[PDB]
Design a binder for this molecule. Structure first.
Ligand SMILES: *O[C@H]1C[C@H](n2cnc3c(N)ncnc32)O[C@@H]1CO
Ligand SMILES: *O[C@H]1C[C@H](n2cc(C)c(=O)[nH]c2=O)O[C@@H]1CO
Length: 94
DNA sequence: TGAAAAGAGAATTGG
DNA sequence: CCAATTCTCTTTTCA
């Protein structure tokens, strides 16, 4: 049984390594607050779908749909700012 | 002033 | 049965 990345792991990994900075970036790195690019977010979503191996092309609408489910478990919450989210502090350094 | 963004229930699916 | 994936409909927001 193989393992596949979780959405919050994929996103957090992109931010820490500095990948796809034109697609997603930190807004407040100390607070774990990050924002997606209005025009270039579809590039990131489709990259998420290729790595997962999904049947359909991944879109930001479907990626955002998955992000909202994290509200039950607290990994990521939506911030009251356009395309902006916040990792829980348990997933961040000191 | 419509695309964009936000939100959502629900059946589905790989593993 | 987890962790999304996919599809659908709705409304507010914004550029
Ligand atoms: O066709 C109507 C509505 C449209 N329009 C575009 N952007 C608008 C804003 N910000 N306020 C109001 N109406 C807006 O232009 C026409 C009215 O001038
Ligand atoms: O939660 C139930 C179903 C669940 N389950 C079902 C099936 C068909 C599967 O392949 N994996 C799996 O975890 O297990 C529980 C019953 O043992």
């Amino acid at each position: 049984a193989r393992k596949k990345l979780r959405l919050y792991q994929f996103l957090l990994g992109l931010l820490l390594r500095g990948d796809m900075r034109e697609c997603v970036w930190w807004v407040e790195p100390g607070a774990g607050v990050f924002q997606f690019s209005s025009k270039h977010k579809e590039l990131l979503a489709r990259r998420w779908g290729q790595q997962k191996g999904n049947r359909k092309r991944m879109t930001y609408q479907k990626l955002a749909r998955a992000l909202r489910n994290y509200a039950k478990t607290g990994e990521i919450r939506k911030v009251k700012r356009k395309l902006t989210y916040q990792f829980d502090s348990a997933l961040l350094p000191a």
